[PDB]
Each structure stands twice: as structure tokens, then as C-alpha cells.
Amino acid sequence: LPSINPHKKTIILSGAPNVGKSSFMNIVSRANVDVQSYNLYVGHFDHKLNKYQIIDTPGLLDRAFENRNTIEMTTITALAHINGVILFIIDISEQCGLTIKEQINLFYSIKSVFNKSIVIGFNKIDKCNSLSIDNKLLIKQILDNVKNPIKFSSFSTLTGVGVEQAKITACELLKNDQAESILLDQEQLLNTKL
Template sequence: MRNPFEKMPTVLTADEIIDKAFRRAEKAASALTPKGGPRAKARQREELRIRTISNVIRDNLKKLLDRTPGVSELPPFYRELVDTLVDRDQFHRSLAHVNWAIKTIRNLEQRYAEKIRYSRDPDEMSRLRRQFYGRVADVIRDIADDLEYLNQARNVLKDLPVVDLNLPTVVIAGHPNVGKSTLLRVLTNARPEVASYPFTTKGINVGQFEEHYLKYQVIDTPGLLDRPLSERNEVERQAILALKHLGKVIVYIFDPSEYCGYPIEEQTHLFEEIYAEFGEFPFIVVLNKVDIADEEKIKTVENFVRSKGLEPLRISALNGEGLDELKRRVIELVKPMVEEQARKIMEKELRKYRDEL
């Protein structure tokens, strides 16, 4: 899936829209070669101005509405992220106001075009056209705040992460420097893409691997699942919780070598927090850097992990030790979910097929 707000256009300010429409109307009027007597000529010119203004403004605003998805229609992952970035009610209210402006301008256009058509006096036609200009400008100024709000919203929403919501996804967690991004690189055999993500300056790293014709997505979340949740503010927490809609399995990394700079007690503390928060997910716990870690420290971490009812796995992202087993465990956990999803898709297709018969 792409970022749902990718196509949202830059939103012009009220003044910019008015200027643009009025300039276009003048250009259209001066390019016109009207036919008939002075009255017919004036009528054609004024009507063209009115139609042009209305068209330019309505096209512009319609494009904005057409290319902006409603927050409530989004998949839960995006919905939750959007809620951390913009006020959903205000966002929808502003879109509704834009819709109101489109309709109002359309009505004004019809009313004034008709008045001009029935008028017999060129001066009056020009007076009516100016009146129309004034009313349209009022309508656009009425939604000036909404336009501004939508543009601000666009500037943050266009940076939402691009992730494939249909792929079973493994989320990697653990303190900084325990080897998360190294693991992602060796697991996915590809240069991971960096997708922006709210409230992290580094974005998230997204990679994929394929096994038996099924694709899996792996996500490393620098700055998100690498320090205690209790230290986060409300909005950051929500950005972290949005990951729940994405991840199917959590791979938690310990660094028993402590070269990462976090003593084992701190690492177990972070694990406890994340395990409590994401408890409904299957966890795979790995001990990385076993190539340089003390056996004693490895054992300490292993005992801790076993006390949680989990079976730890020793790996080295650097020399490849344990990685095949890690993949095997990931697939073992995720495969039933993928198959379940495939079954649902097939049933849906079958139903469609039967309905067509």
C-alpha cells in the first residue's frame, strides 16, 4: 500500500485561489471574440467570466476532496497514526466546509449567469458580474482557515510511512546498538528502504524476504521500541501502539555482550515493558552478538527469557550464526496467519464467482 495521502495536492490559500480564478477569468474574457451587437457581446463576456471563475475554483477544490481520503475509511494502522498528527474532527470539518464552498459557488454561478442572460443593459451586466466576484470571494474567505488547516495537515500526512499492510510483518525491538538494523539487512538480503514515521527523526527501516513464494516484511523501528514506554508522552505512545496494527510477530533482541552500552538489567527492564504492552503478539527472543559475548552473561539472559516461558535463540547478525533457525521460527509463527489470510481471499473470490453464476 502507498501512503494514502500521497496524492493530496498542495492546498492554496484563500487569496491565492481568488487571484488565480480572477486572473484566468480576465484571460479568458480577453481571448474571446464575441459575436453580435454590443449587448450580446457584453453578455457573452460577462457570462464567460462567471463560468471561468466558478470552474477554476471548483476544479481546484474538487481535486483536493477527491485526493484526500477520509480518516475513518483508512486501515486502522494509518487511522491511528493520523490521529497522532491531526485532529480528526477538525480535518473532517474542514473537508466538509470545502464541499460546502463548491456547492455554494455552483449555485451562485447559476443564479448570476441567469441574471446576466436576462439583463438588457451592459452596465448592469458588469455590475452583476462584480457582485458575483464579491460573493465568491466571501465564500472562499469563509473557508480560509479550513484551507490553511488542510495544508498544514497535508504537510505532515504526506510523510506517513509507506508499508505494505497486506504482508505479514515482523517488528524488531530492542535497545539502540543491539544490532537491529544489522539483523534487518541480513534477514532481508536487500537494502532496506527508509520510510518516514511520525515522532522519529530516523524513520523506520523496511525490508522484505521471500520464502516458498510467500513474502514477509521486516521492520526496524529506531527510536520507537528502544526505550521504555513509560518515558513517552501520549502522542508518542500512540505512534508506537499503531505498530500493533502492522506487526504479526515481535523479534526482541538482547545484546548479552553489553557492547551496545546498556547493561543487562536495563535490557531486561525494557523487555518487560514491551512484552507487557505487546503481550498478545507472539515473541521471538534472540540473543545477538554471541560471537563476542561472555558465556556467563548469555546464560543470565537465557535464564531470564526462559523464566518468561519463552525459548531464547542465540544468533550473530554479523557472522550469520542462528539466522536460519530465526527465519524458521518466524515462518512457523507467521505462516498460519498468512494461510488464513489466503483462505479468506480465496473464499471471497469464490463467493464473487458464485454470485456471478
């Protein structure tokens, strides 16, 4: 809503407070970041001759929607209608102050506003690897509960390892969705004609 181009290819960052969202944005955009107020953050980067933005909205996409007022919801909804892929980051070290299960609960609670592609980012691997079987099966359950096309990416925004890889899989998930969706529109229009 505040000075965002809705047509530019976008990574929409989401996840609990202190999971590494602002860190991720800063790394991939080399801090080429516009600070906009309603604070909303828009990082910019190029990948493979294409221009991208990456958006971080602390206070909006880091907590459940139950407590939002109308204006906040319209802002959230406006973001959900951008040309974007979601990067939902889970801090698997739990240093953010919430357990993996509480972070997955957050994901289910808010993934309904987005049917876009989603990358689940497992961050802070410098402080982890492995996981409880209930946690691994909770993560696996995401693939069953979710109609959205979903990929996984592990990284550390403290050490840099896997970060660029995570950025690459987000972009390509977007491409594939753009490709699949334009076909459905082309098909419906011809099926109408015929």
C-alpha cells in the same frame, strides 16, 4: 503508520540501541529496505514462496514507553496492530551498553503493547556463549512472566551464524499464530450461530 502495509506478514524488530536490529534487517532483506520518515525502516524478503516485511523503528521500540508523547504512542500502537511477530533482540555480549538484566527489563516494559508471538533473539554470540546463573534464570523467568507464545534464537549478525535460522523460527511462529487465531474466530462465530 508511514507507508506500511498492515496485512503483509511482518517481523517487528525491537530491542535496546546497538543490539543489532538494523544489522539483522539488512542481512535478511539483502538491504531491500525502504527508508520512510515520520526514520522508519522496512526491509523485504521472501521465504518459502511467501512475501515478508521486516520493520525497524529506532527511537520507538528500543526504549521504555513512559517518556513517549501521544503521537509517538499512536505510532507504536499502530505497529502493534500489524500482521506481525516480534523479534526482540538481546545483545548478550552487553557491548550495546546495557546489561542483559537491563535489556530484559526493557522487554517487560514494552511487551505489553504487543498478544502476538515473540522470538527472543540472543545476538552477538561471536562475543559470548556462558551466562551468569542469575542471567540464565532471568531469561527462564520470561517463559513464566509471559502469556505470549515465545521462542528463543541465538545468532551473530556480525558472522551470520544462526541468522537465517532465527528468521525461519520467527516466520513459523507467525504461521502458528495465524492458524490458532483464525480457529478461535471461526469457533466463536459458529458457537454464536448454534
